Amino acid sequence: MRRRPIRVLSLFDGIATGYLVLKELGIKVGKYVASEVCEESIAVGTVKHEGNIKYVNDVRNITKKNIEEWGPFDLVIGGSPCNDLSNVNPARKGLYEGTGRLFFEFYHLLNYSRPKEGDDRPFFWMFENVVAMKVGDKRDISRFLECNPVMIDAIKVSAAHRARYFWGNLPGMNRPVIASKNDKLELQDCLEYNRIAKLKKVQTITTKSNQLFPVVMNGKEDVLWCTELERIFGFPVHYTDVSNMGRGARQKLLGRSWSVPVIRHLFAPLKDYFACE
Amino acid sequence: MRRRPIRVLSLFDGIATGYLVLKELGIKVGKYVASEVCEESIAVGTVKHEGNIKYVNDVRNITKKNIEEWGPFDLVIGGSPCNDLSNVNPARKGLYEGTGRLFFEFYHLLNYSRPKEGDDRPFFWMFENVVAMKVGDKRDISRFLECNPVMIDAIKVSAAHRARYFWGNLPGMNRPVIASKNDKLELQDCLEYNRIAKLKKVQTITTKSNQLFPVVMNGKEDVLWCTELERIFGFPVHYTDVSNMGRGARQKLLGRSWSVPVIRHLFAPLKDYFACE
Amino acid sequence: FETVPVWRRQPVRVLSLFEDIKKELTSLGFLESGGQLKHVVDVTDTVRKDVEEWGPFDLVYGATPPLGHTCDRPPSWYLFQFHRLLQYARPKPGSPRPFFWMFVDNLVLNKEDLDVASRFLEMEPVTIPDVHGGSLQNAVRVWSNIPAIRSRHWALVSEEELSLLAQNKKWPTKLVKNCFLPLREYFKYFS
Amino acid sequence: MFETVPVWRRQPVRVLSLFEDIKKELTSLGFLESGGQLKHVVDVTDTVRKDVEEWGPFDLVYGATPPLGHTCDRPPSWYLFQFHRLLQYARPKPGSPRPFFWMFVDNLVLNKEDLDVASRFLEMEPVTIPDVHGGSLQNAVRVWSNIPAIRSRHWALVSEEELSLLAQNKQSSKAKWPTKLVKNCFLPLREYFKYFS
Ligand SMILES: COc1ccc2c(c1)[nH]c1c(C)nccc12
Ligand SMILES: COc1ccc2c(c1)[nH]c1c(C)nccc12
C-alpha cells in the first residue's frame, strides 16, 4: 500500500515513445527494459534519455529466466511490425509468417510477465497494431490476448490520420479521448516559418513517401520537413536529430512509431498507481 | 548622439552568423540585408530568424543605387569564399581568378556604403578570410582594404582549430580574446551522451569528410554528429536541422561558416554604439 | 507427478486437436468402447470458457496434418493454437494433478517454425523415425512432458536427412502410439 | 561634368599614367613640354594612398593593359583592379571640386568575364575603338572614361565575335601598343588645360 516507481517491459520499442510518454506524465520509471533491433532507434532512445533504457536486443532471445530476473514488471507494452499485416502491402504475409508472427512473441512473453496466482499486485499491459488488417488476423489476435481492442484515431489529438487498435487492460481505455490545448490538431500548427498548409489533416504517414506535397512555401509545392513530421507525431522537435540521420531514416522511424498524444491518453490513468512528482 | 538600432549589410552571409551574433548580444537590428546564393543557407537563415533578414541574390548584381536605397548601413560585414585562396587546395586559382576574386566585390560595395566625407556618423566594417593563403594575396587584400588583419584562432574560445584573418575598423579588434564559462573549449564538452573524445581539440574543419574518427562510443570509433559539430562551431543545437538536410549538407554549411564565439568577441564592443534591450 | 495406485486410477480425459487419436488410445487401454475424448479440428473460435466447460482434461494432444496432405493453414497455426488451448486447459497452480500434453509434427513445420515451436514449448523436439532396410522412410518430431519421451530420440537422423525426406514426399500414428504407454501408471486400463 | 576653364589660367595637366606610359603621345598633342609633370609607375602593388597624394595632385589618371600578343606576368583583371584602387586614391575629395578625368584602355586582353567586372567597377560599358584598313579589322581597343566625347567614337559595326577572332589570331601570332587609337581621345581636354605649341 505505497507508491513505487513503475517497471516497464517494452517490446518492439523503437524510438522509446513509451518512456518519453511516461516521463512527460511525471511518473518515476525505475526500470525500462526495451527490446529493439533497429540501430538508429536504439541511438535515439539512448541519447534522448541518457541511457536510462536497458536494451536487450531481439525479442526471440528473451527467455523465461530473462523475464523473471529482469522483472517483476508492472507495465508490459508492445507493438508488432505492421508491414506484414496491412493492406498497404500487396505481398502481405498475414499474421502467421513474415514479421507479423512476431505478435505471438509478445503473447508468449506477456504470459511470462503476468503475476503469479495468489499475487494480485497491479499489472497492466497494452498491445498496439494497425486497423488496416484482415479481420481474421484481428480476431485471432483478440483470441490469443483474450480481449477485444479499442480503436483510437490520432486525428482526434494529432494532425494526421492514424487509426490503430489497442488491446490491453489499462485503466480507462474506453473513456472518450479529449485533446489538450497544447496538442497541435491541424497541420498549420506544426509547420515552420513561412509555410502554409494545404490540408488541415494529413493522410496517414507510413515508413515511405497531391497529398505528398502538402505544403506551399513561396508559392511552390514542398514536402514536409523532419521537424514538421516530429510535431505531427507529437514528438519533441529534433527528437530524431541523432547520429547523422537524414530525411530517409527519420521518416522511417517516425512512420512506424506511436503518436505520443494517443499514448499519453492511454498512459495518463497510470499516474494514480505509481510514484509521481 | 542617440544610440539607434544597427543596420547591417552582410555579403556572403551563409547561415546568418552575423544576425545570430547581433541578436544574441541584445542589439536591436533595424535592417539586415544579406547577400547569399545558396538556397540551403538562405533556408536556415529564413526560418531560424523568422524572416527578419532581407535576402539578395548575387553580390555581383548589387548596384550603386541598390546600396544607396537599401541603406544607409552601419555595419558592412563579409567573408568571401576560400577554395581559391587556400593553400591546401592544389588547383587554387589565386585572388584574381575563380571565387577568390569575389573579394573585390566586397571592396567595391564597401566604398559604395562608406559615408560621405562630410558625414561623421558611425560606420564599421569587417572582412574575414583564411590564414592559409599565399603572402601575395594577403598583401593585396591589405592594400585594397587599406589596413592589416588581426589573426584570431577559434581554438581559444572553441573546441576546434580555426585561424582566420580579420580586416576591419571594429572597436577593440586587437584586444586579447578571453573565453567565457559558457564557451565549450574541449571536444568532450560538445559530445552527446555516452561519447568519449580521444582528442581535446579537433583539427581545422572544412567542407569535406585517426582524425576522421575522433570519438569512441562503446569501444568502436565514430565520426561526429551534426549536433556535435554545431556545438563545436558554437551554434545553437539544431541550428542547421532545416529543409531535410543530411550529414553532407549540414557539414558543408558549418564547414565554411564563422566560429560564432569569435564573432561575438568582435561584435561585443558594438553594444556601445547602437540601441539594445 | 508421483504414480497412482491401481485401485484408484480413473479413466483418462483427453483433448485431441487438429488430429484424432481416439482409436489409438482405445487400442492401448485408455478409452473404453462407447466417451472420454473431445476432438476439435478447427479451434479458431475456442475461448477459455469452452475448454473449461469441456470436462477437466488430463491429456492435450495436438498434431499437424500429415506430410503429404496439402495444408489448409500455415504450419505455425497449429502450433500457436495448440499452445493457446494448452494454456487454457492446464490446471490452475492452486491444485496440482496429473496433466500431460503432446504436440507432434510430421515434417510439416519449416525450419524457423521448428525454432519458434521449441521456444514456445520450452523443449527441443524428439525425432521418432520409421527405418527399414537401413533407410529412413518416415519420421515425426514430438514436444511433450510425457515421462519417457526424450529417450525415444534417434540421434542418427540428421536435419538434412529429415528435410530431404520431406522434399521427397495418412498420418503415421504408428510412431506416436507407443509414447503414451508410460501413462498407464496414472489412468485406467480397459481390457 | 566640369565647367569651362578660360585660356589665361589654364594650367598644365598633372597626369598619372599607370602601367603603360603616354608621355610621348600627350606631348605630341601639346599637353606636355620638353624639360616632369607626368608620374609613371608600372608596379603598384606596394604603392599606397599617401604615395598617390605625394606624387599628386593629378588632373588625369590613365591606365592600360599590356599589348595584345604579349603574354603578361599579371592576370588581366589585376591591372583593372589596381587602376580602380589608385584612381580612388587620386580622386579629389568631395569638398573641393575640380576638373578630374580618367581613362582605362584594354587591347583585347580582358576576357568575357573580366569585361563585366570592368563595366561594373567603372560604371560604364566600354567604347570599341577600331583600326580598319581595306574594310578589314586590324586592331582595336576598349575604353572606359569620363572624358567628354569618349562615347561618340564607338563602332557598333564591330561585333564581339570579330574582336574575339582578332584577339585569337594576333595572340597566336605573338606587336606593341597602338596608341594612335586613344590619342584623339584626349583632344576634348585642351579646353580645360594649357596648350604647348
Ligand atoms: C522498429 O520497429 C521494429 C521492427 C521489427 C522488430 C523490432 C522493431 N524489434 C524486433 C525484435 C526485438 N525482434 C525481431 C524483430 C523486431
Ligand atoms: C555560403 O558560402 C558562399 C559561397 C559562395 C558564395 C556565397 C556564399 N555568396 C556568393 C555570392 C553573393 N556571389 C557569388 C558567390 C557566392
Rounded CA-CA distance B247/B240 in Å is 10
Q: Estimate the share of chain B in helix, then strand, then coil, as percent rounded to the nearest 5.
A: 30, 20, 50
Q: In sequence order, what DSSP letters do the residues of A3-24 get, joined into one string?
A: ---EEEEEES-TTTHHHHHHHH
- Tell whether C77 lies on the interface with A, counting CB pairs under 8 A: yes
Rounded CA-CA distance C118/A240 in Å is 38
Among candidate residues A176, A183, A179, A180, the one with its CA nearest the CA of residue A232: A183
Residues B15/B262, Cβ–Cβ less than 8 Å? no
Rounded CA-CA distance D66/D73 in Å is 10
Q: In sequence order, what DSSP letters do the residues of B125-143 get, joined into one string?
A: EEEEEES-S-HHHHHHHHH
- Residues B51, A193: C-beta atoms closer than 8 Å: yes
What residues are paired with B165 via a beta bridge?
Answer: B129, B151
Among candidate residues B225, B229, B227, the one with its CA nearest the CA of residue B256: B229
Quick one: which H or E segment has residue B32? strand B29-35
The single residue listed with the C-alpha cell 549540414 is B250
**CB half-sphere exposure, B63, CA atoms < 13 A:** 6
Residues C139/C157, Cβ–Cβ less than 8 Å? yes
Q: Tell me the C-alpha to C-alpha distance, in Å, between residue A130 and each of A37, A87, A172, B179, D24.
A: 20, 10, 21, 54, 93
- Residues A194, B51: C-beta atoms closer than 8 Å: yes
**Long-range Cβ contact pairs of A53-58 (< 8 A, separation 24 or more):** A53/A13, A53/A16, A53/A19
- Residues B60, D94: C-beta atoms closer than 8 Å: no
Residues A252/A209, Cβ–Cβ less than 8 Å? no
Tell me the resolution in Å. 3.1
**Catalytic annotation, residues of A:** 82
Q: Tell me the C-alpha to C-alpha distance, in Å, between residue C56 and each of B96, B269, C86, C147.
A: 97, 89, 12, 21
What's the maximum distance between 2 C-alpha atoms anywhere in chain D?
51
Residues C12/C37, Cβ–Cβ less than 8 Å? no
CB atoms within 10 A of CB A275: 15
Among candidate residues A255, A268, A267, A41, the one with its CA nearest the CA of residue A161: A255
Rounded CA-CA distance A103/C80 in Å is 11
Please give the angle made by the CA atoms of B41, B47 and B53, to the nearest 5 degrees: 75
The alpha helices in chain A, defined as continuous H runs, are: 17-24, 39-47, 64-70, 102-113, 135-145, 226-232, 247-255, 260-267
The full length of chain B comes to 277
Interface of B with D in 86-105 (CB under 8 A): 94, 96-97, 101, 104
Residues C102/C121, Cβ–Cβ less than 8 Å? no
The residues spanned by each domain of chain B are 1-277
Rounded CA-CA distance A181/A173 in Å is 21
What residues are paired with B27 via a beta bridge?
Answer: B276
Q: Tell me the C-alpha to C-alpha distance, in Å, between residue C4 and each of B107, B213, C148, C185, D107.
A: 106, 71, 17, 7, 121
What residues are paired with B256 via a beta bridge?
Answer: none
Burial B91-103 (b: 16+ CB within 10 A, else e): ebebbbbbebbbb
Q: Whose CA is nearest to atom 7 of ligand 2?
A: B12
SS3 of residue A261 by DSSP: helix
Among candidate residues D167, D36, D178, the one with its CA nearest the CA of residue D112: D167
Rounded CA-CA distance A92/A100 in Å is 9
- Ligand 1 center from residue A110 Cα (angstroms): 16
- Ligand 1 center from residue A53 Cα (angstroms): 16
The full length of chain C comes to 191
Type of residue found at A192: E
- Among all residues of chain C, which has the CA nearest to that of A145? C84
Rounded CA-CA distance A232/D45 in Å is 61
- Residues B117, D94: C-beta atoms closer than 8 Å: yes
Measure D190 CA to nearest chain B CA, in Å: 31
Beta carbon pairs, A and C, within 8 Å:
37
- Over the Cα atoms of chain D, what is R_g? 17
Between the CA atoms of A150, A155, A161 and A162, what dihedral angle is there, to the nearest 10 degrees?
Answer: -30
Residues B215/B192, Cβ–Cβ less than 8 Å? no
Q: Which residues of D touch B116 (CB under 8 A)?
A: 94
Rounded CA-CA distance C61/C54 in Å is 15
Among candidate residues B267, B259, B24, the one with its CA nearest the CA of residue B153: B259
Discontinuities in chain B (C→N > 2.5 Å), after residue: 209
> In the structure grid, which three cell numbers stand for residue D104, read together?
582605362
Residues B24/B261, Cβ–Cβ less than 8 Å? no
Contacts for B26 with CB less than 8 Å, ≥ 6 apart: B271, B276, B277
The residues spanned by each domain of chain D are 1-197
State the best of D114, D120, D124 to mutate against chain B, taking most chain B CBs within 10 Å: D120
Rounded CA-CA distance B183/B187 in Å is 11
Contacts for A1 with CB less than 8 Å, ≥ 6 apart: none
- Residues A244, B246: C-beta atoms closer than 8 Å: yes
Rounded CA-CA distance B255/B253 in Å is 5
Rounded CA-CA distance B92/A64 in Å is 66
Q: Estimate the share of chain A in helix, then strand, then coil, as percent rounded to the nearest 5.
A: 30, 20, 50
CB atoms within 10 A of CB A218: 9
State the best of B59, B62, B97 to mutate against chain D, taking most chain D CBs within 10 Å: B97
The alpha helices in D18-148, defined as continuous H runs, are: 23-29, 49-55, 76-90, 112-122
What DSSP character marks residue A245? -
Residues A20/A29, Cβ–Cβ less than 8 Å? no
The single residue listed with the C-alpha cell 533504457 is A53
Of A94, A104, A111, the CB nearest to C80: A104
Q: Which residues of A touch B225 (CB under 8 A)?
A: 242-244
Residues A45/A13, Cβ–Cβ less than 8 Å? yes
Q: Tell me the C-alpha to C-alpha distance, in Å, between residue B16 and each of B21, B48, B167, B204, B271.
A: 9, 9, 19, 21, 19
Type of residue found at C154: W
- Residues A244, B223: C-beta atoms closer than 8 Å: yes
Among candidate residues A146, A70, A145, A143, the one with its CA nearest the CA of residue A113: A70
B35 lines ligand 2 (CB under 6 A): yes
- Over the Cα atoms of chain A, what is R_g? 19
Kindly tell me whether chain B and chain C come into contact, counting contact as 3+ Cβ pairs under 8 Å.
no
Give me the phi and psi of A136, to 5 degrees please: -65, -40
CA dihedral (C22, C24, C29, C34) positive or negative: positive
SS3 of residue A74 by DSSP: coil
Q: 3-state SS of chain C?
A: CCCCCHHHCCCCCEEEECCCCHHHHHHCCCCCCCCCEEEECCCCCCCHHHHHHCCCCCEEEEECCCCCCCCCCCHHHHHHHHHHHHHHHCCCCCCCCCCEEEEEECCCCCHHHHHHHHHHCCCCCEEEEEEECCEEEEEEEEEECCCCCCCCCCCCCCHHHHHHHHHHCCCCCHHHHHHHHHHHHCCCCCC
Q: Which residues of A touch C74 (CB under 8 A)?
A: 94, 96-97
Rounded CA-CA distance D135/D167 in Å is 18
Residues C96/C50, Cβ–Cβ less than 8 Å? no
Please give the order of strands across the beta sheet that includes D60-64: D38-41, D15-19, D60-64, D101-106, D136-145, D127-133
**CB half-sphere exposure, A133, CA atoms < 13 A:** 26
Interface of B with D in 121-160 (CB under 8 A): 136, 139-140, 143-144, 146
Among candidate residues C153, C148, C102, the one with its CA nearest the CA of residue C128: C153
Among candidate residues D90, D99, D104, the one with its CA nearest the CA of residue D142: D104
Burial A63-82 (b: 16+ CB within 10 A, else e): eeeebeebbebbbbbbbbbb
Residues A97/A91, Cβ–Cβ less than 8 Å? no
The single residue listed with the C-alpha cell 512506424 is A256
Quick one: which H or E segment has residue B163? strand B163-168
> In the structure grid, which three cell numbers stand for residue C111, read together?
525450419
Rounded CA-CA distance C31/C37 in Å is 8
Type of residue found at B138: K
Rounded CA-CA distance A48/A42 in Å is 10
The full length of chain D comes to 197
The single residue listed with the C-alpha cell 485533446 is A179
Give me the phi and psi of D80, to 5 degrees please: -65, -50
List residues forming the annotated binding site of B for S-adenosyl-L-methionine.
13-17, 36, 58-60, 256-258
Measure B234 CA to nearest chain A CA, in Å: 17
Give me the phi and psi of D55, to 5 degrees please: -65, -25
- Ligand 2 center from residue B58 Cα (angstroms): 7
What DSSP character marks residue A59? G
Q: 3-state SS of A151-193?
A: EEEHHHCCCECCEEEEEECCCCCCCCCCCCCCCCCCHHHHCCC
B256 lines ligand 2 (CB under 6 A): yes
- Ligand 2 center from residue B209 Cα (angstroms): 21
Burial (CB < 10 A; 0-12, 13-18, 19+), residue A55, is middle
Measure D115 CA to nearest chain B CA, in Å: 13
Interface of A with C in 52-81 (CB under 8 A): 60, 64
> In the structure grid, which three cell numbers stand for residue D89, read together?
586614391
Residues A169/A124, Cβ–Cβ less than 8 Å? yes
Rounded CA-CA distance A96/C71 in Å is 14
Rounded CA-CA distance A5/A10 in Å is 16
The single residue listed with the C-alpha cell 518430431 is C141
- Over the Cα atoms of chain C, what is R_g? 17
Type of residue found at D58: F
Q: In sequence order, what DSSP letters do the residues of B38-86 get, joined into one string?
A: -HHHHHHHHHTTTT-EEEES-GGG--HHHHHHH---SEEEE----TTT-
Quick one: which H or E segment has residue B10? strand B6-11
Residues A16/A242, Cβ–Cβ less than 8 Å? no
> In the structure grid, which three cell numbers stand for residue A277, read together?
512528482
